[PDB]
Enzyme design. Structure first.
Site, PDB file in Angstrom:
ATOM      1  N   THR A 159     -10.401  -2.677  12.007  1.00 56.11           N
ATOM      2  CA  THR A 159     -10.452  -4.100  11.736  1.00 56.11           C
ATOM      3  C   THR A 159      -9.533  -4.582  10.619  1.00 56.11           C
ATOM      4  OG1 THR A 159     -12.643  -4.147  12.659  1.00 56.11           O
ATOM      5  CG2 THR A 159     -12.015  -5.938  11.178  1.00 56.11           C
ATOM      6  N   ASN A 180      -9.864   1.424   6.955  1.00 58.27           N
ATOM      7  CA  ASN A 180     -11.002   0.675   6.433  1.00 58.27           C
ATOM      8  C   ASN A 180     -11.498   1.331   5.150  1.00 58.27           C
ATOM      9  OD1 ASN A 180     -11.152  -1.414   8.454  1.00 58.27           O
ATOM     10  ND2 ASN A 180     -12.572  -0.146   9.678  1.00 58.27           N
ATOM     11  N   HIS A 420     -13.744   2.803  17.644  1.00 56.02           N
ATOM     12  CA  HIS A 420     -12.327   2.467  17.834  1.00 56.02           C
ATOM     13  C   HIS A 420     -11.582   3.063  16.638  1.00 56.02           C
ATOM     14  CE1 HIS A 420     -13.034  -0.551  14.690  1.00 56.02           C
ATOM     15  NE2 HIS A 420     -14.193  -0.703  15.314  1.00 56.02           N
ATOM     16  N   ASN A 685      12.954  10.565   4.385  1.00 56.74           N
ATOM     17  CA  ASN A 685      11.928   9.949   3.523  1.00 56.74           C
ATOM     18  C   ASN A 685      10.884   9.166   4.340  1.00 56.74           C
ATOM     19  OD1 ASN A 685      13.565   7.745   4.209  1.00 56.74           O
ATOM     20  ND2 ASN A 685      13.833   7.069   2.094  1.00 56.74           N
ATOM     21  N   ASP A 691      18.653   6.864   7.051  1.00 57.48           N
ATOM     22  CA  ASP A 691      18.976   7.489   5.756  1.00 57.48           C
ATOM     23  C   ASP A 691      20.442   7.292   5.417  1.00 57.48           C
ATOM     24  OD1 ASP A 691      16.312   8.506   5.732  1.00 57.48           O
ATOM     25  OD2 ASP A 691      17.054  10.561   5.969  1.00 57.48           O
TER      26      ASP A 691
HETATM   27  C1  LIG Z   1      -7.890 -13.882  11.348  1.00 59.99           C
HETATM   28  C2  LIG Z   1      -8.071 -13.283   9.986  1.00 59.99           C
HETATM   29  C3  LIG Z   1      -9.377 -13.009   9.548  1.00 59.99           C
HETATM   30  C4  LIG Z   1      -9.567 -12.497   8.255  1.00 59.99           C
HETATM   31  O1  LIG Z   1     -10.799 -12.181   7.803  1.00 59.99           O
HETATM   32  C5  LIG Z   1     -11.897 -12.566   8.640  1.00 59.99           C
HETATM   33  C6  LIG Z   1     -13.222 -12.124   8.081  1.00 59.99           C
HETATM   34  N1  LIG Z   1     -14.226 -12.924   7.712  1.00 59.99           N
HETATM   35  N2  LIG Z   1     -15.267 -12.082   7.435  1.00 59.99           N
HETATM   36  C7  LIG Z   1     -14.959 -10.764   7.598  1.00 59.99           C
HETATM   37  O2  LIG Z   1     -15.665  -9.793   7.456  1.00 59.99           O
HETATM   38  N3  LIG Z   1     -13.621 -10.762   8.013  1.00 59.99           N
HETATM   39  C8  LIG Z   1     -12.877  -9.545   8.337  1.00 59.99           C
HETATM   40  C9  LIG Z   1      -8.526 -12.266   7.343  1.00 59.99           C
HETATM   41  C10 LIG Z   1      -8.841 -11.897   5.936  1.00 59.99           C
HETATM   42  C11 LIG Z   1      -8.568 -12.878   4.986  1.00 59.99           C
HETATM   43  C12 LIG Z   1      -8.693 -12.614   3.635  1.00 59.99           C
HETATM   44  C13 LIG Z   1      -8.660 -13.713   2.664  1.00 59.99           C
HETATM   45  N4  LIG Z   1      -8.673 -13.370   1.347  1.00 59.99           N
HETATM   46  O3  LIG Z   1      -8.746 -14.871   2.965  1.00 59.99           O
HETATM   47  C14 LIG Z   1      -9.044 -11.357   3.207  1.00 59.99           C
HETATM   48  C15 LIG Z   1      -9.374 -10.334   4.123  1.00 59.99           C
HETATM   49  C16 LIG Z   1      -9.326 -10.580   5.493  1.00 59.99           C
HETATM   50  O4  LIG Z   1      -9.420  -9.771   6.583  1.00 59.99           O
HETATM   51  C17 LIG Z   1      -8.889  -8.602   6.718  1.00 59.99           C
HETATM   52  F1  LIG Z   1      -8.710  -7.892   5.663  1.00 59.99           F
HETATM   53  F2  LIG Z   1      -9.377  -7.876   7.694  1.00 59.99           F
HETATM   54  F3  LIG Z   1      -7.641  -9.081   7.006  1.00 59.99           F
HETATM   55  C18 LIG Z   1      -7.192 -12.493   7.789  1.00 59.99           C
HETATM   56  C19 LIG Z   1      -7.023 -12.986   9.114  1.00 59.99           C
HETATM   57 CL1  LIG Z   1      -5.430 -13.223   9.691  1.00 59.99          CL
HETATM   58 CA   LIG Z   2      14.863   6.778   5.831  1.00 62.87          CA
HETATM   59 CL   LIG Z   3      -9.901   4.548   7.983  1.00 57.10          CL
HETATM   60 ZN   LIG Z   4     -15.863  -1.688  14.688  1.00 54.91          ZN
END
Ligand SMILES: Cc1cc(OCc2n[nH]c(=O)n2C)c(-c2cc(C(N)=O)ccc2OC(F)(F)F)cc1Cl
Ligand SMILES: [Ca+2]
Ligand SMILES: [Cl-]
Ligand SMILES: [Zn+2]
Ligand SMILES: *[C@@H]1O[C@H](CO)[C@@H](O[C@@H]2O[C@H](CO)[C@@H](O[C@@H]3O[C@H](CO[C@H]4O[C@H](CO)[C@@H](O)[C@H](O[C@H]5O[C@H](CO)[C@@H](O)[C@H](O)[C@@H]5O[C@H]5O[C@H](CO)[C@@H](O)[C@H](O)[C@@H]5O)[C@@H]4O)[C@@H](O)[C@H](O[C@H]4O[C@H](CO)[C@@H](O)[C@H](O)[C@@H]4O[C@H]4O[C@H](CO)[C@@H](O)[C@H](O)[C@@H]4O)[C@@H]3O)[C@H](O)[C@H]2NC(C)=O)[C@H](O)[C@H]1NC(C)=O
Ligand SMILES: [K+]
Ligand code: NA
Length: 805
Positions: A159, A180, A420, A685, A691
């Site tokens: 995710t 993650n 996943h 690298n 390179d």
């Molecule tokens: C569509 C979309 C959703 C996103 O979060 C949805 C969300 N809401 N609640 C929950 O758990 N998630 C994952 C985020 C996201 C934004 C920020 C931020 N600071 O605004 C920080 C972390 C985030 O998500 C990430 F790290 F996974 F990217 C980015 C995009 Cl493009």
């Molecule tokens: Ca290189």
């Molecule tokens: Cl991971």
């Molecule tokens: Zn999942």
């Protein structure tokens, strides 16, 4: 410390964060434990639910209600989303016929069509077909707008790496969210999904869309929604923001659903329990579209319905345990599950050795369901190595399986039936893309594409200049009705030399021999014409590649192939040849087995030599244009030129010879001829980028002949295979690979068998986009075709994946 005794009165889901320890009312306040005392009361109302009913119509406003059905609600911007349906006799958006949106139809004061990104976690590509009966709102977006049959996520197919790739257009190795779960050795800090620490700015690289927008004067809604804000409230919040005054209103918004991922983990991707989460997500889309319709925005806003990754069947019983392989299991730390990352438990333990860990994990059990790699040896298409948060040792886990350190980890952590994270080419990991709105095309299907491309398009949708990223801007122009981005081809930096015959045979002292002293005005004019480029039109079908960096190189012409020969690296950067369907494969004649011939167009000083190969007991050599495919006995001598030779480990020559002797002709038979461009890559690298010479870690012993880390081939033919590759009137078809140049075939567990049982499987694993090869070589291909540049950009991002349907 938060002074939670301030109030959220008129501040609910405010767009700017207030400075601590003043209490917060923004959507991150829960994640920080920092909301004002009255945030739940004021900002998370639930009274009387989310829908108007006949009796509530024209009610007297009650500020306690979750949403409103009073007469003033449209101008307050806070009706329940079904208000106009229940109370004003309107239809739901889903019940309306699809009507082309040729131009934005926006209220006065809208400077651009807003963009709403509706992101769904764990939404597998096949749900679009398999769940179509229970998702009418999503089906209408899909059929009426622009959709791909699937969208490829990034690796790992988790995710956080995928959503942040959506936000930035960057590979995880570049944006820094590489899993993650992560350890950064420079920080000596660990990243976890739980809590507020993951919010620390040092984790998050690149520039996400909401910052790109803000920097360029385009306002953004906040993208992250705390887990306890219900979906209906997320939608209501977006709709409320869309009713702000012009100067305050954002132009870009995101919704996020943790479903269907949450239920998919518990029930598997197609568990009968999955129908309900799909119906619930569709109802949420319906709420949003009804809400936009009420605000007269449903033919103004561009909506993107997009997933992060799919979901596979995975159960506790399908777990490989490292304790069944390693004696030392307690001296390692494993990041486990659908991928493995291994590092030393203690940096003080000097008896830790990656080499012995890898060997103990290599082809040890007959049906072994993971494969170990040093990260630099992972398929280049994964772009998963250039980050200190990615451990040197990686386990690629087979789909449907997990890896864990010890059995006790699995039962002291069956619960789950889905997971996943696997290789992003796996069918079950593919996800979804639909775009609906004035800027997207009407009822249009587009080919599958990679999620790294979307940031550029989202910037186009918003009139923003994208920050530098890994998309290829213009490759998705075919999704758009307007706002397309019209790039120019990059300028060639180095012009080739065209050497003629300049050296006598006796000036060369390369230690090479060839049995070629076998001796005609008819055919003498011919050999001259061929060396001046007379067959070049047949073998260089799309123009010569442009060299995009400063270097010294020669174009060399021959009957059967053309090459761009580097005086700096002492070998071709590229070698181009066409093999028709009718071409014949021949053997290397006995008398020519060890033949290498000086090239009288190229100085001894800028040539390889045979003696270095003789002395280097580990390194042998191969040829870029294959002698097996020579057009005639006489043209075969050109294939043995020292300028066509490249260094190859004997183990790799097994792979290369089978590709050149068997597979090329197979592809020409199947594809109605192919044009092949092959060459070396140097990426010591592991940054995915060509390179410079001072980065090369290995040379052929006693020489300045650099050893490639990889060999590539780009294999092009006519998409309409009724036309031969060399007489193609329309679109092209391509497949490419970047094969690791390894001294053993330890990667291929079946390698003691005939090449027919393992080589093509290896090649498939190392499939690549032309764009990947461009990064790795500083070359630009397809410079002279009859195709539009955006179409060629799409072709250059194509990946042949070899998965079934
Ligand atoms: C569509 C979309 C959703 C996103 O979060 C949805 C969300 N809401 N609640 C929950 O758990 N998630 C994952 C985020 C996201 C934004 C920020 C931020 N600071 O605004 C920080 C972390 C985030 O998500 C990430 F790290 F996974 F990217 C980015 C995009 Cl493009
Ligand atoms: Ca290189
Ligand atoms: Cl991971
Ligand atoms: Zn999942
Ligand atoms: C995918 O797209 C991306 C984006 O276009 C491509 O990545 C770019 O590649 C460039 C080349 O690798 C790289 O340019 C370098 O930038 C250096 C400045 O770096 C900072 O500034 C930028 C701009 O704001 C910022 O984005 C950077 O962000 C990185 O680092 C922070 C933390 O440090 C992370 O939070 C973030 O995630 C990101 O990390 C990623 O990139 C870095 C490399 O920068 C990796 O180390 C990480 O693993 C991770 O992948 C930075 O905050 C600049 O200083 C460099 O210049 C050096 O090299 C040149 C050669 O021309 C030389 O002339 C200079 O002298 C200098 O060398 C000196 O330092 C050397 C090292 O210490 C030393 O050896 C020398 O002796 C010298 O003293 C360089 O120009 C650019 O930063 C990234 N951008 C991003 C966002 O990643 C990527 O290549 C694409 N991928 C493919 C496959 O195409
Ligand atoms: K040798
Ligand atoms: Na092997």
């Amino acid at each position: 410390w938060t002074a939670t005794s301030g109030s959220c009165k008129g501040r609910c889901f405010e767009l700017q964060e207030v400075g601590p320890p003043d209490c917060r009312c923004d959507n991150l306040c829960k994640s920080y434990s920092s909301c004002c005392h009255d945030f739940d009361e004021l900002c998370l109302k639930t009274a009387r639910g989310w829908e108007c009913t006949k009796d509530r119509c024209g009610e007297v406003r009650n500020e306690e209600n979750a949403c409103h059905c009073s007469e003033d609600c449209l101008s307050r911007g806070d009706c329940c989303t079904n208000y106009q349906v229940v109370c004003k006799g309107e239809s739901h958006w889903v019940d309306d016929d699809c009507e082309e949106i040729k131009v934005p139809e926006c209220p006065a004061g809208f400077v651009r069509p807003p963009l709403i990104i509706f992101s769904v976690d764990g939404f597998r590509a096949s749900y679009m077909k398999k769940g179509s009966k229970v998702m009418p709102n999503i089906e209408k977006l899909r059929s009426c707008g622009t959709h791909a049959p699937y969208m490829r996520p990034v690796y790992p197919t988790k995710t956080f790496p995928n959503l942040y790739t959506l936000a930035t257009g960057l590979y995880p190795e570049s944006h820094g969210i590489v899993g993650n779960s992560m350890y950064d050795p420079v920080f000596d800090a660990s990243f976890h999904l739980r809590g507020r620490e993951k919010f620390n700015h040092r984790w998050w690289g690149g520039q996400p869309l909401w910052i790109t927008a803000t920097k360029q004067g385009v306002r953004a809604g906040t993208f992250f929604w705390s887990v306890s804000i219900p979906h209906e409230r997320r939608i209501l919040t977006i709709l409320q923001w869309l009713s702000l005054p012009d100067n305050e209103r954002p132009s870009v918004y995101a919704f996020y659903s943790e479903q269907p991922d949450f239920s998919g983990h518990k029930y598997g991707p197609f568990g009968p329990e999955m129908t309900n989460p799909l119906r619930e997500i569709d109802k949420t889309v319906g709420q949003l579209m009804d809400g936009l319709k009420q605000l007269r925005l449903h033919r103004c806003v561009n909506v993107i319905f997009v997933g992060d990754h799919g979901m596979e069947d995975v159960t506790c019983d399908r777990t490989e345990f490292l304790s069944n392989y390693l004696t030392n299991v307690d001296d390692i730390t494993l990041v486990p599950g659908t991928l493995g990352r291994i590092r030393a438990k203690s940096i003080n333990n000097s008896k830790y050795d990656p080499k012995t860990i890898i060997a103990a994990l290599t082809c040890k059990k007959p049906d072994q369901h993971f494969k170990p790699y040093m990260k630099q040896h992972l398929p280049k298409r994964l772009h998963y190595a250039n980050n200190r948060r990615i451990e040197d040792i990686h386990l690629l886990v087979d789909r449907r399986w997990h890896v864990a350190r010890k059995p006790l980890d699995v039962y002291k952590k069956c619960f789950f039936q889905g997971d996943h994270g696997f290789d992003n080419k796996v069918n079950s990991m593919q996800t979804v893309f639909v775009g609906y709105g004035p800027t997207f095309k009407y009822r249009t299907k587009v080919p599958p594409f990679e999620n790294i491309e979307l940031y550029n398009v989202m910037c186009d949708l918003l009139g923003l200049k994208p920050a530098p990223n890994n998309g290829t801007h213009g490759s998705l122009n075919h999704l758009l009705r307007t706002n397309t981005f019209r790039p120019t081809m990059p300028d060639e930096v180095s012009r080739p030399n065209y050497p003629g015959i300049m050296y006598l045979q006796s000036e060369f002292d390369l230690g090479c021999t060839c049995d070629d002293k076998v001796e005609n005005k008819l055919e003498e004019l011919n050999k001259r014409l061929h060396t001046k480029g007379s067959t070049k039109e047949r073998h260089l079908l799309y123009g010569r590649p442009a060299v995009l960096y400063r270097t010294s190189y020669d174009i060399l012409y021959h009957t059967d192939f053309e090459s761009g020969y580097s005086e700096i690296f002492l070998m071709p950067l590229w070698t181009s040849y066409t093999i028709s369907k009718q071409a014949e494969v021949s053997s290397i004649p006995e008398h020519l087995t060890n033949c290498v011939r000086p090239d009288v167009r190229v100085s001894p000083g800028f040539s390889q030599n045979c003696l270095a190969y003789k002395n280097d007991k580990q390194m042998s050599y191969g040829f870029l244009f294959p002698p097996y495919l020579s057009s005639s006995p006489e043209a075969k001598y050109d294939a043995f030129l020292v300028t066509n030779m490249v260094p190859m480990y004997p183990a790799f020559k097994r792979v290369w010879a089978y590709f050149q002797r068997v597979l090329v002709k197979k592809y020409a038979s199947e594809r109605n001829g192919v044009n092949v461009i092959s060459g070396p890559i140097f990426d010591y690298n592991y940054d995915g980028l060509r390179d410079t010479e001072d980065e090369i870690k290995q040379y052929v012993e006693g020489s300045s002949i650099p050893v490639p880390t990889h060999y590539y081939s780009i294999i092009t033919s006519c998409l309409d295979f009724t036309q031969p590759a060399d007489k193609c009137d329309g679109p092209l078809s391509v497949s490419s690979f970047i094969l690791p140049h390894r001294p053993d075939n330890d990667e291929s567990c079946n390698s003691s068998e005939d090449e027919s049982k393992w080589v093509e499987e290896l090649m498939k694993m190392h499939t690549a986009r032309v764009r990947d090869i461009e990064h790795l070589t500083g070359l630009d291909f397809y410079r002279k075709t009859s195709r539009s540049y955006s179409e060629i950009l799409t072709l250059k991002t194509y990946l042949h994946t070899y998965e079934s349907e």
